[PDB]
């Protein structure tokens, strides 16, 4: 089930001493209080400045138990996207009033969401799939 | 030593496991040295990605259930941190797996908030790789050093 | 104690000098000894043990 | 006759009760067989875990470990990867025989 979905306009793609990992900074196009900061594997999914990405955070993908490599005859929520990661939320913060930030870590690849309407259904769960279309 | 009394004391009292901290001021004296210090900065780096065939070779190459390194009589793995285009594990996620197999299953994970020796400007702009974070036995942030 | 010949290098150290030195009897054969069932060798590194 | 009974050796202290998670010990081997056999076992769609290990370099012992998802043992997965390692060396031998004829 989708816990967050928006569309983010990329402002800066910073390689920064890495050959496969870039830092993305993207404010959204629908709400004005919310920003993104993401570490993507730029070899698999190359992101430039002034892109129009589509970030979605789900809690699962649709009766699974543990990971198993994909086979034929499956269908996932990841089929609709281009770059799916997986990681844990570890820190909640309110930056000021009317803003609450969450921090994700996709095995060391970090993400920071700031905003106001994500305090509804971003729990502190040890599993939140992150999906990017286009 | 040549009897069972003196064997039970080199196993329990004078053994190397109980001499981890020194009696002078409590500092630890035992740890890895040079090529192990300078590989943790490469393995637990953020550039380090591993395919599935590479990931299980590094787990079994260090942890063998035959010699008695596991605790669950079966090697357990993690889901990858990249699913769709090409499924990949991260180098910090191998450290989570080697602590998931050598620490006992009844206790919860280790929770540590520490630092490194390598400053946050060496890695780039707005990185946080000086802060070592272990949450539920999972390295989520920061490389590993001599520290 | 004894002067005797007084030419130097006095022989037969006697039963006190068999006890008093760094070696003597009481630090080379009581407080430190030589042992059976021991070995020594040059050491070499290994990361697989 | 006499089949050789010290080459392959299943270590029962690491072996599952179903049979699906076992660890073998091959004598007088190294990375040559072990890295080539691990590539071929890992292409089985039923293999969950596969990796080899040389315990110490001074003796010539090779531990390999196979774990399957069920519905195939680690001995049935070892012998498919021993079959396809033979049938892969018969494609390299045939393509290289033809090109010597094709010179």
Curated annotation (Swiss-Prot), chain A:
Subcellular location, record wording: Nucleus
Pfam family, one: RNA_pol_Rpb8
Keywords noted in UniProt: Acetylation, DNA-binding, DNA-directed RNA polymerase, Nucleus, Phosphoprotein, Ribosome biogenesis, Transcription
Ranges for region Non-specific ssDNA binding: 14-37
Keyword Chloroplast: no
A GO biological process held by the record: tRNA transcription by RNA polymerase III
GO cellular component, one term: nucleoplasm
PANTHER family for this protein: DNA-DIRECTED RNA POLYMERASES I, II, AND III SUBUNIT RPABC3 (PTHR10917:SF0)
Misc. comment: Present with 6210 molecules/cell in log phase SD medium.
Similarity comment: Belongs to the eukaryotic RPB8 RNA polymerase subunit family.
Function: DNA-dependent RNA polymerases catalyze the transcription. of DNA into RNA using the four ribonucleoside triphosphates as substrates. Common component of RNA polymerases I, II and III which synthesize ribosomal RNA precursors, mRNA precursors and many functional non-coding RNAs, and small RNAs, such as 5S rRNA and tRNAs, respectively.
Name of the protein in its database record: DNA-directed RNA polymerases I, II, and III subunit RPABC3
Source organism phylogeny: Eukaryota, Fungi, Dikarya, Ascomycota, Saccharomycotina
UniProtKB/Swiss-Prot annotation, chain B:
Cellular localisation: Nucleus, Nucleolus
Top-level taxon of origin: Eukaryota
Quaternary structure and interacting proteins, as annotated: Component of the RNA polymerase I (Pol I) complex consisting of 14 subunits: RPA135, RPA190, RPC40, RPA14, RPB5, RPO26, RPA43, RPB8, RPA12, RPB10, RPC19, RPC10, RPA49 and RPA34. The complex is composed of a horseshoe-shaped core containing ten subunits (RPA135, RPA190, RPB5, RPO26, RPB8, RPB10, RPC10, RPA12, RPC19 and RPC40) where RPA135 and RPA190 form the DNA-binding cleft. Outside of the core, RPA14 and RPA43 form the stalk that mediates interactions with transcription initiation factors and newly synthesized RNA.
Family: Belongs to the RNA polymerase beta' chain family.
Function (record text): DNA-dependent RNA polymerases catalyze the transcription of DNA into RNA using the four ribonucleoside triphosphates as substrates. Component of RNA polymerase I (Pol I) which synthesizes ribosomal RNA precursors. Besides, RNA polymerase I has intrinsic RNA cleavage activity. RPA190 and RPA135 both contribute to the polymerase catalytic activity and together form the Pol I active center. In addition, subunit RPA12 contributes a catalytic zinc ribbon that is required for RNA cleavage by Pol I.
Anything else known: Present with 2840 molecules/cell in log phase SD medium.
Protein name: DNA-directed RNA polymerase I subunit RPA190
Species whose genome carries this gene: Saccharomyces cerevisiae (strain ATCC 204508 / S288c)
Gene that encodes it: RPA190
Shown chain mapped onto the complete sequence: 638 to 784 of 1664
Swiss-Prot record, chain D:
Endpoints of the signal sequence: none
Subcellular location: Nucleus, Nucleolus
Residues annotated as transmembrane: none
GO biological process, one term: transcription elongation by RNA polymerase I
A GO molecular-function annotation: DNA-directed RNA polymerase activity
Residues in coiled coil: none
Residues joined by cross-link Glycyl lysine isopeptide (Lys-Gly) (interchain with G-Cter in ubiquitin): 95
GO cellular component terms given for this protein: nucleoplasm; nucleus; RNA polymerase I complex; RNA polymerase III complex
Assigned keywords, A-Z: DNA-directed RNA polymerase, Isopeptide bond, Nucleus, Phosphoprotein, Ribosome biogenesis, Transcription, Ubl conjugation
Complexes and interactors: Component of the RNA polymerase I (Pol I) and RNA polymerase III (Pol III) complexes. Component of the RNA polymerase I (Pol I) complex consisting of 14 subunits: RPA135, RPA190, RPC40, RPA14, RPB5, RPO26, RPA43, RPB8, RPA12, RPB10, RPC19, RPC10, RPA49 and RPA34. The complex is composed of a horseshoe-shaped core containing ten subunits (RPA135, RPA190, RPB5, RPO26, RPB8, RPB10, RPC10, RPA12, RPC19 and RPC40) where RPA135 and RPA190 form the DNA-binding cleft.
Protein role: DNA-dependent RNA polymerases catalyze the transcription of DNA into RNA using the four ribonucleoside triphosphates as substrates. Common core component of RNA polymerases I and III which synthesize ribosomal RNA precursors and small RNAs, such as 5S rRNA and tRNAs, respectively.
Family: Belongs to the archaeal Rpo11/eukaryotic RPB11/RPC19 RNA polymerase subunit family.
Miscellaneous: Present with 8680 molecules/cell in log phase SD medium.
Protein name: DNA-directed RNA polymerases I and III subunit RPAC2
Annotated organism of origin: Saccharomyces cerevisiae (strain ATCC 204508 / S288c)
Section covered of the full-length record: 40 to 142 of 142
């Amino acid at each position: 089930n989708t816990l967050f979905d928006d569309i983010f306009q990329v402002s800066e793609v910073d390689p920064g001493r890495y050959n496969k990992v870039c830092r993305i900074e993207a404010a959204s196009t629908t709400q004005d209080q919310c920003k993104l900061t993401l570490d993507i594997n730029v070899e698999l999914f190359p992101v430039a400045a002034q892109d129009s990405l589509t970030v979605t955070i789900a809690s699962s993908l649709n009766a699974t138990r543990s990971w198993r490599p994909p086979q034929a005859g499956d269908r996932s929520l990841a089929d609709d996207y281009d770059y799916v990661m997986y990681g844990t939320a570890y820190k909640f913060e309110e930056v000021s009033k009317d803003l609450i930030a969450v921090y994700y870590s996709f095995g060391g690849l970090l993400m920071r969401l700031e905003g106001n309407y994500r305090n509804l259904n971003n729990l502190k769960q040890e599993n939140a799939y992150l999906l990017i279309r286009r | 030593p040549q009897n069972e009394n003196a064997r039970a004391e080199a196993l329990n009292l004078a053994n190397t496991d109980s001499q981890y901290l020194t009696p002078t001021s409590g500092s630890p004296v035992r740890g890895l040295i040079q090529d192990h210090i300078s590989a943790g900065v490469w393995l637990t780096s953020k550039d380090s990605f591993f395919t599935r065939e590479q990931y299980q070779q590094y787990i079994y190459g260090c942890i063998r259930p035959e010699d008695g390194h596991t605790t669950r009589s079966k090697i357990v793995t993690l889901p990858p941190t990249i699913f769709k285009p090409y499924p990949l594990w991260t180098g910090k996620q191998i450290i989570t797996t080697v602590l998931l197999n050598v620490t006992p299953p009844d206790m919860p994970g280790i929770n540590l908030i520490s630092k490194n020796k390598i400053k946050n400007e060496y890695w780039g702009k707005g990185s946080l790789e000086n802060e070592v974070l272990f949450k539920d036995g999972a390295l989520l942030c920061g490389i590993l050093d001599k520290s | 104690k004894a002067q005797g010949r007084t030419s130097g290098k006095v022989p037969i150290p006697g039963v006190k000098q068999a006890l008093e030195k760094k070696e003597g009897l009481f630090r080379k054969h009581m407080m430190g000894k030589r042992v059976n069932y021991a070995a020594r060798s040059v050491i070499s590194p290994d990361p697989n043990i | 006759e006499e089949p050789d009974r010290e080459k392959i050796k299943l270590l029962t202290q690491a072996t599952s009760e179903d049979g699906t998670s076992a660890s073998f010990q091959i004598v007088e081997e190294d990375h040559t067989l072990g890295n080539a056999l691990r590539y071929v076992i890992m292409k089985n769609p039923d293999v969950e875990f596969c990796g080899y290990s040389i315990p110490h370099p001074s003796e010539n012992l090779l531990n390999i470990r196979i774990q399957t998802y069920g519905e195939t043992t680690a001995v049935d997965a070892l012998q498919k990867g021993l079959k396809d390692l033979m049938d892969l060396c018969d494609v390299v031998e045939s393509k290289f025989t033809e090109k010597i004829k094709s010179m």
